Design a protein around this ligand. Structure first.
Ligand SMILES: [Cl-]
Ligand SMILES: [Cl-]
Ligand SMILES: [Cl-]
Ligand SMILES: [Cl-]
Ligand SMILES: [Cl-]
Ligand SMILES: [Cl-]
Ligand code: NA
Ligand SMILES: [Xe]
Ligand SMILES: [Xe]
Ligand SMILES: [Xe]
Length: 129
Protein backbone atom coordinates (compact mmCIF):
# COMPACT_ATOMS: atom_id res chain seq x y z
CA UNK A 1 0.00 0.00 0.00
CA UNK A 2 1.17 3.49 -0.83
CA UNK A 3 0.16 5.94 1.89
CA UNK A 4 -0.76 9.57 1.46
CA UNK A 5 1.07 11.92 3.84
CA UNK A 6 -1.70 12.90 6.26
CA UNK A 7 -2.97 9.36 6.10
CA UNK A 8 0.32 7.94 7.27
CA UNK A 9 0.56 10.68 9.87
CA UNK A 10 -2.81 9.72 11.28
CA UNK A 11 -1.91 6.03 11.38
CA UNK A 12 1.44 6.68 13.06
CA UNK A 13 -0.33 8.86 15.58
CA UNK A 14 -2.84 6.19 16.47
CA UNK A 15 0.00 3.72 16.87
CA UNK A 16 1.67 5.93 19.47
CA UNK A 17 4.54 7.32 17.41
CA UNK A 18 3.83 11.01 18.00
CA UNK A 19 6.64 12.14 20.34
CA UNK A 20 7.77 8.55 21.01
CA UNK A 21 11.18 8.72 22.72
CA UNK A 22 10.72 12.41 22.10
CA UNK A 23 10.50 12.41 18.30
CA UNK A 24 7.59 14.42 17.03
CA UNK A 25 5.26 12.96 14.41
CA UNK A 26 6.80 15.03 11.62
CA UNK A 27 10.09 13.18 12.11
CA UNK A 28 8.50 9.78 11.49
CA UNK A 29 6.60 10.91 8.42
CA UNK A 30 9.68 12.55 7.03
CA UNK A 31 11.68 9.39 7.62
CA UNK A 32 9.04 7.25 5.94
CA UNK A 33 8.90 9.69 3.06
CA UNK A 34 12.58 9.44 2.27
CA UNK A 35 13.11 5.81 3.31
CA UNK A 36 10.22 4.36 1.39
CA UNK A 37 8.27 7.16 -0.31
CA UNK A 38 5.49 5.91 1.90
CA UNK A 39 5.35 2.51 0.21
CA UNK A 40 4.79 -0.37 2.60
CA UNK A 41 6.20 -2.80 0.06
CA UNK A 42 9.58 -1.19 -0.53
CA UNK A 43 12.62 -3.41 -0.31
CA UNK A 44 16.28 -2.53 -0.84
CA UNK A 45 19.20 -4.95 -0.72
CA UNK A 46 22.27 -3.80 1.13
CA UNK A 47 25.84 -4.52 0.12
CA UNK A 48 26.39 -6.74 3.13
CA UNK A 49 23.67 -9.02 1.83
CA UNK A 50 21.15 -7.67 4.33
CA UNK A 51 17.87 -6.16 3.12
CA UNK A 52 15.71 -3.20 4.21
CA UNK A 53 11.95 -3.71 4.38
CA UNK A 54 8.85 -1.62 4.46
CA UNK A 55 7.83 1.97 5.03
CA UNK A 56 10.67 2.51 7.47
CA UNK A 57 13.16 0.26 5.71
CA UNK A 58 13.97 -1.93 8.66
CA UNK A 59 17.08 -4.01 8.20
CA UNK A 60 17.32 -7.79 8.24
CA UNK A 61 20.78 -7.69 9.82
CA UNK A 62 19.33 -6.95 13.26
CA UNK A 63 15.61 -6.57 13.41
CA UNK A 64 13.72 -9.13 11.32
CA UNK A 65 14.25 -12.61 9.93
CA UNK A 66 14.26 -13.04 6.17
CA UNK A 67 16.02 -16.38 6.05
CA UNK A 68 18.79 -15.02 3.84
CA UNK A 69 20.87 -12.79 6.13
CA UNK A 70 23.39 -15.18 7.66
CA UNK A 71 24.31 -14.55 11.29
CA UNK A 72 21.65 -11.86 11.47
CA UNK A 73 19.60 -11.16 14.54
CA UNK A 74 15.84 -10.82 14.76
CA UNK A 75 15.39 -8.39 17.63
CA UNK A 76 11.84 -7.56 16.63
CA UNK A 77 10.88 -11.22 16.53
CA UNK A 78 9.26 -10.87 13.15
CA UNK A 79 9.50 -12.24 9.63
CA UNK A 80 10.71 -9.35 7.51
CA UNK A 81 7.67 -10.03 5.36
CA UNK A 82 5.48 -8.71 8.17
CA UNK A 83 7.08 -5.32 7.58
CA UNK A 84 5.61 -4.98 4.10
CA UNK A 85 1.96 -5.18 5.14
CA UNK A 86 -0.56 -2.40 4.49
CA UNK A 87 -1.14 -2.55 8.23
CA UNK A 88 1.83 -0.63 9.66
CA UNK A 89 1.53 -2.10 13.16
CA UNK A 90 4.54 -4.43 12.89
CA UNK A 91 6.77 -1.78 11.38
CA UNK A 92 5.73 0.67 14.10
CA UNK A 93 6.28 -1.79 16.92
CA UNK A 94 9.74 -2.62 15.56
CA UNK A 95 10.62 1.04 14.99
CA UNK A 96 9.86 1.77 18.64
CA UNK A 97 12.46 -0.80 19.61
CA UNK A 98 14.99 0.61 17.15
CA UNK A 99 14.61 4.22 18.29
CA UNK A 100 15.05 3.04 21.85
CA UNK A 101 18.19 1.08 21.02
CA UNK A 102 20.52 3.96 21.82
CA UNK A 103 21.12 6.17 18.81
CA UNK A 104 17.49 7.35 18.47
CA UNK A 105 16.38 8.10 14.90
CA UNK A 106 19.98 8.28 13.65
CA UNK A 107 19.46 4.59 12.82
CA UNK A 108 17.59 5.82 9.77
CA UNK A 109 20.19 7.25 7.40
CA UNK A 110 17.68 9.17 5.39
CA UNK A 111 16.29 10.67 8.54
CA UNK A 112 19.59 12.00 9.68
CA UNK A 113 20.59 13.11 6.16
CA UNK A 114 17.24 14.62 5.10
CA UNK A 115 15.00 15.20 8.13
CA UNK A 116 17.23 15.95 11.09
CA UNK A 117 17.50 19.67 11.74
CA UNK A 118 14.79 20.56 9.24
CA UNK A 119 11.29 21.78 9.89
CA UNK A 120 9.76 18.33 9.89
CA UNK A 121 6.59 19.90 11.24
CA UNK A 122 5.88 20.68 7.62
CA UNK A 123 5.21 16.96 7.01
CA UNK A 124 2.07 17.04 9.15
CA UNK A 125 0.84 20.49 8.08
CA UNK A 126 -2.73 20.49 6.79
CA UNK A 127 -3.52 17.06 8.18
CA UNK A 128 -6.56 16.42 10.33
CA UNK A 129 -4.87 15.07 13.43
CL1 LIG B 1 4.68 14.29 -0.25
CL1 LIG C 1 6.19 17.40 13.97
CL1 LIG D 1 10.20 -4.10 -3.14
CL1 LIG E 1 18.66 -15.03 8.42
CL1 LIG F 1 -2.14 1.02 9.35
CL1 LIG G 1 17.14 10.36 21.14
NA1 NA H 1 17.90 -11.08 10.60
XE1 LIG I 1 15.31 -6.23 -3.02
XE1 LIG J 1 16.88 0.71 10.22
XE1 LIG K 1 5.77 2.47 10.60
Amino acid sequence: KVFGRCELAAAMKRHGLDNYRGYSLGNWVCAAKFESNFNTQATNRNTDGSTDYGILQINSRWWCNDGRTPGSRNLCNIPCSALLSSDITASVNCAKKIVSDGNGMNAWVAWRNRCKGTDVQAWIRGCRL
